[model samples]
Target: DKGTRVFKKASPNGKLTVYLGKRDFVDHIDLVEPVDGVVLVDPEYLKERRVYVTLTCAFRYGRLTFRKDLFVANVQSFPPAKKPLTRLQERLIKKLGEHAYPFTFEIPPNLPCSVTLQPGPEDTGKACGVDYEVKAFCAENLEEKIHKRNSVRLVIRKVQYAPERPQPTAETTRQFLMSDKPLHLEASLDKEIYYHGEPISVNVHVTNNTNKTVKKIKISVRQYADICLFNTAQYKCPVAMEEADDTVAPSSTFCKVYTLTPFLANNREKRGLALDGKLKHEDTNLASSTLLREGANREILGIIVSYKVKVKLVVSRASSDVAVELPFTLMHPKPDDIVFEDFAR
Candidate 1:
């Protein structure tokens, strides 16, 4: 339902008509497959003089942009390979009032998701932005400039889906040295997965047998980004940070509870960590975590999102910081329509 898009316009002289059909699906074009596009010119335009037609794709970054030639199927659409149209070809356009030319281009399989970086008020005449567009132009020489009133361009966007249920189970034990005495530290989460607009509690159990006192605790939730679509390696970038500070007495063993929420209000000013997959200079908080599949889809591999919790004892300086970490998945809320099990709405 979200694959095809269209654009229509006339040349500056109004003698030439241009129409285009392009793709609108984000996961449709992985560069592994050929992108099929079409252009149709009105009969009157086809009867006009010679003009070169070209199709191209491009990346628009802030203050900079570049284009790649898809395929030059019709360097000269109107007229013959030279001039004067034959009676038969002219008869065809006359019958339908237009000529349709289809083009296919082999795309590179590893292009990053189409994004807009540092968007300005106008969104145009900018140097920083990541965008894709399919464009077609007609001119005597191919070097002619394309304008809104003349050339035809269609915009393309790419995005990621969030996980349905992102609960992970993990627990670990580490020893802390306090005043030459050994102390045991254990930490774990109540559940394995978490959703947006929810609270997460960290349960820590520690045995402080040394004379040195136990300090506060710090907790941080990290967001990982796998920017592999740009030919990059596996990785995750921190999207949110939260801390818990409470005095822990020495020489005692008991469960300590600290709570923090990963929702938008809790995570602001963090880049690329919003559940909505975005951030801005003045944005109050992240939109929401992007939805992702538990097993992961092979074709959808632009941006991968995951989360983890790090707990630090902030123990006495006489010993190393007793820290334990458990990883978990963050996802979006699932829809609540079960009546149509076999139907996708």
Candidate 2:
């Protein structure tokens, strides 16, 4: 979204308008970079009320709360324009409309991304969230209260691209009493990072040295999300999975291949129970794995994303199945192949 947005109102009493400079929120807006916005009001509203445009952010939980806002930018048309206004102001009015007002504001760079944690199936009381919004309103007096019926509000978010890194692979070996012998399991991944709609391939090999018959192989790609503030993480969605039809006889070795694409269309609700970074249903993307590394900022709290490939070998006994898991990063590459030489700390 190109940092542009629009909103409208029809009223016989007062007018209040608000819009952003983009269809969506930017990953991050430096204090030095202005956030673009538009505001409009009816002539009667301006004459009858004091109007103001505001940028606001809030953090809410069970019962505690904090709210902050400011109107760092705006354009005023006054004196009946008898002396004429600047060309920039004129162009802004022309670009939007006679009633439309253009405003810009510099936002703090450390502001966190927007996140909403709806009440889960078992959660009690009220829901919680770290929310952001842009609003404009008209008041009979600046001290008057503002509400949805009397104001215009729009929601936006800040998101970052998953860090770029090399491919990830994993392997392990184990033994079970049911097999009464050593079972060698080797797993590998084609690469580490992936973008939306891209396919992923998982290679698995099993060497059974005993007389244990393998029934089938199950492979899955799971997306995991975590809400660090809550100190709890139970997010796990099987974005894609498969069961190979082939089985191995006693004392035999074989290789199984599973290919899956974690596309939204193909794996909808399957990516279940995601944390606050839930993707809009219409979006065909899985939430990019949130990264937390040695140097990552610990002061900020938000949803963390990660992924894993699970491999399991079915056996005659339910408790003796052999399985392994590989954790990897799922992310989108820079648009122009530009690297984040210095990703925000």
Candidate 3:
């Protein structure tokens, strides 16, 4: 059966001092005194946990009263949160676990001071009850100090459990797959010719020979021969008009001699010298007779000239899968060079 005890004693009139051990672990304490009655207990001890204790003191002057409260200092280590916890509470919990000894104190010439200890809400089950023990000794003298020291002992076991952490899933993986292929093309060009300085009309015949349609097309031209030239007036010649007057003095047909100039003087001079005496003199004499008058002292010499015309075409195509290209050459003959014998057959 639970029992309660009470006592009565006169409160000390002179200065009184009190000290509580394990003060760091204490939370709160309450003190009460009656002026007419005795100070039953100058200091009372209260246990909040098996490892912590609380102390309370009271003084009475007539009907008024004065009181003080303190806590026993004890080392305890609370379980740290797997995650970050409040700094102040975290440090205290660490300290509690670090120092697990019971609380104790030395009475420093004082009797009115009190101490208390309480379990934090996060304490473990074993630490829920007060298991603290204390010894008090007077601080005035060596032997008396040891005997009068008031102290409490507490053994705080470390309590901690790792917090639950989330694991990453396939969705959290950072990765990618990419790919690409080159573009294909096809192109071509047709053969044709035009005059000098004229826009050469070329048919860019593009056959999307591939299964895909070409998105873009480009065409260009380049010279393929050593002398690729275009002639504007190949067969056309301009002639100047001359004034003519008829004068019948004698029935005589008169002709004026016109000298002809050759483009290559060295060739012309060599030809002239060869005409004087050579195995081909018969052909040259025939040509000289055709240009001279029969029985007249006048003779004329004719010259032959020739020229050439050439052109080239090129084409290219750009495609994703394939490419194509084509080239061509065109030719033209000189003007006024008739190879026919009868002009009006």
Best by TM-score: 2
- Which model, 1 or 2, shows the larger lDDT? 2
Model 2 has an lDDT value of 0.56
Q: Compared with the true structure, what per-residue lDDT tens digits does model 1 show for residues 115-155?
A: 33222345444322234455555544556565554455444
TM-scores of the candidates are: 0.49, 0.68, 0.14
Stretches off by above 4 angstroms in model 3 are: 1-195, 205-213, 225-323, 330-345
Against the true structure, candidate 3 reaches a TM-score of: 0.14
Q: What TM-score does prediction 1 earn?
A: 0.49
Best by lDDT: 2
lDDT, candidate 2, 34-88, per-residue tens: 4565566677646766556566655454535432231123223221213233334
- Provide the overall lDDT of each model, using Cα atoms, as 2-decimal numbers: 0.47, 0.56, 0.20
Model 2, residue 268: C-alpha shift (Å):
5.6
lDDT of 3 by residue, 1-345 (tens): 422221111113311121211111211112111111001112222122111222222211111222212223222111110323333323333333332222222221122111111112242111111112232221222233232223322221111111112211101111111212222122222223221122222222222222223333223322211100111111111011111231111222222211111111123322111111112222111001011123422111111111111111111223222223233221111112111121010
Q: Cα RMSD for candidate 3?
A: 56.3
